[PDB]
Structures are given as structure tokens and as C-alpha cells.
């Protein structure tokens, strides 16, 4: 248990998906690489958390719209 | 009194020989690494010395 995400990663995931939907895709490693230059994330441990939530949200987006 | 008994006590060792290099206290002395600093004066000056709490 204890894998619930935080506002700090969720806000960033929504924002970068909105800004760079065209650049980004549904591959985790591709997303964790594009984030490295589209955002100055101080921490790798937070960067890949953001990337994981980004992949989850984009997999959702391919099916149906969300609040973002 | 006079010269031959005022400081005549053998003080080459023990608690009484060593003292705090800061506040001249004889309790809680930290002699590791040649600190010669009090248990409390060390907590005061550890940041200046260079000791950092990591874990």
C-alpha cells in the first residue's frame, strides 16, 4: 500500500500533459526523458514519479476525457 | 597557604586535571579526537567545528 500520489506530482503531471501533449506519448521511459528538458525537476526520484503519473493519465486520455 | 602546599596536590590525571576548554567545567568532558569540550558546549559549537547531523 502507500502509493497514493501527492499534489506536487499531480499538478505537475496535469500541467505538462496540457502543455506538451503532442510531444509526449504513452511510454514511461520516453516520458521520463521528455520531462528532463520540459521541466527543471530538482530530484530524479520525483521526476520518475511524475513520469509514472503522466503515463497513467495519458493512458486514461487515450480512452476518455478527464478533469485535465 | 605558602608555596609548598597551595597547589601541592598531585593532579597529573583524574577528573580534576582535565577541564572544559570553554567553560572550565569538569563534567561531561569529551576527550575524543582531542576535543576537550563539554557535553553541552559541544552541542553548542558542533556546527562551527564541522560536525553535522546526518543520521
Amino acid at each position: 500500500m502507500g502509493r497514493v500520489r501527492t499534489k506536487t506530482v499531480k499538478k505537475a503531471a496535469r500541467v505538462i500533459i496540457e502543455k506538451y501533449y503532442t510531444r509526449l506519448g504513452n511510454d514511461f521511459h520516453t516520458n521520463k526523458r521528455v520531462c528532463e528538458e520540459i521541466a527543471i525537476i530538482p530530484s530524479k526520484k520525483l521526476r520518475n514519479k511524475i513520469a509514472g503519473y503522466v503515463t497513467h493519465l495519458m493512458k486514461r486520455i487515450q480512452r476518455g476525457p478527464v478533469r485535465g | 597557604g605558602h608555596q609548598q602546599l597551595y597547589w601541592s596536590h598531585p593532579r597529573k590525571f583524574g577528573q580534576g586535571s582535565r577541564s572544559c576548554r570553554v567553560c572550565s567545567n569538569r563534567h561531561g568532558l569529551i576527550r575524543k579526537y582531542g576535543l576537550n569540550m563539554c557535553r553541552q558546549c559541544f552541542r553548542q559549537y558542533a556546527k562551527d567545528i564541522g560536525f553535522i547531523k546526518l543520521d
Binding site: - | 579526537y33 582531542g34 562551527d48 567545528i49 564541522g50
Partner: protein, 171 residues
């Protein structure tokens, strides 16, 4: 080797010298807004820099006070003659120096200003010099047996984790 002391004791002793020098300079130059001491040590000579708010005060008439301090720090620490140099440097953005603002607050309260006035002036000066936030506490007894603590905050202020060490200046 035999004459030299081990590296561990050497670094501990160097830190000891830093602490004692800082405390002596604090007590001596407290009324001149002494911010801190930075010591550059080379194997040949020792260079020390007194970061202060008022260089014109820390160095006396014709530099009398600074050369007097140089003699003092020679005598205490056994430095050979002409092997240590004392410089005085003005602190940049003194409003961001926790020690300097605490010293000015002490000077105001010693003068006898109301703590609310003095603390709010310090808050305004810090925020005017530009900071994410600041926080002052005055605790103790004034005119009464029962002691009170008064706290004045503004802006952001982080407390926990590693970032506090190099984000928050404390005094």
C-alpha cells in the same frame, strides 16, 4: 609523522580554532554588527575575513582596531609574526543576515524601544531587503515576573528536511 598530528585531530583542532575565533569576534565586535568570520588557511599563512556590517567601525582610526585584533589573534593562537592577515569585508544585503538583524534588535531593545515597534521594524527591513519570509521570537520577562514570548512572522517559512539548512538563516 611523529611531530605532525593525525588528520582527524588536525581537522577537529581547525574547527575548534574556527569556533573560538568566531565566539571571540562575536563578543568583541558585537556592537558593530559582526556578521561572521571566514577563514582561508594555506600551509604558509592564514587569511581571515571579518564579514561585518560596518567596516569603518570594525577598523579603527588608521586601522588601529584591526591591527590590534591581528596582534591579539597572534598572541592567543601562537601564530608566528607576520603569518596571519585580518581583512574586513562589508556584508552584502545585511537585511538577509540573521545575525545582523538579531543584533540590531538587541540594540533597539537595550535602547528601550517597545518590542512590537522594534520587531515590526525588523520584519519590514527584512522583507524590504527581499526574502521569501522571516520569523522573529522575543521571549522573556519585561516589567513582570511571568515571562511571555511574542512571535512575529511573515511570508513563507520552511522548517523540516534538508533544504532548511541552506534556505533558512538562524540567529
Amino acid at each position: 609523522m611523529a611531530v605532525q598530528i593525525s588528520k582527524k585531530r588536525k581537522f577537529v583542532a581547525d574547527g575548534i580554532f574556527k569556533a573560538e575565533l568566531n565566539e571571540f569576534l562575536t563578543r568583541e565586535l558585537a556592537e558593530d554588527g559582526y556578521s561572521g568570520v571566514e577563514v582561508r588557511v594555506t600551509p604558509t599563512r592564514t587569511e581571515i575575513i571579518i564579514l561585518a556590517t560596518r567596516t569603518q567601525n570594525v577598523l579603527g582610526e588608521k586601522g588601529r582596531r584591526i591591527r590590534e585584533l591581528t596582534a591579539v589573534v597572534q598572541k592567543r593562537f601562537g601564530f608566528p609574526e607576520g603569518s596571519v592577515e585580518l581583512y574586513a569585508e562589508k556584508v552584502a544585503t545585511r537585511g538577509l543576515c540573521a545575525i545582523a538583524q538579531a543584533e540590531s534588535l538587541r540594540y533597539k531593545l537595550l535602547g528601550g524601544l517597545a518590542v512590537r515597534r522594534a520587531c515590526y521594524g525588523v520584519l519590514r527591513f527584512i522583507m524590504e531587503s527581499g526574502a521569501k519570509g522571516c520569523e522573529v521570537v522575543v521571549s522573556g520577562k519585561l516589567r513582570g515576573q511571568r515571562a511571555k514570548s511574542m512571535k512575529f512572522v511573515d511570508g513563507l517559512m520552511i522548517h523540516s528536511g534538508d533544504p532548511v539548512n541552506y534556505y533558512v538563516d538562524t540567529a
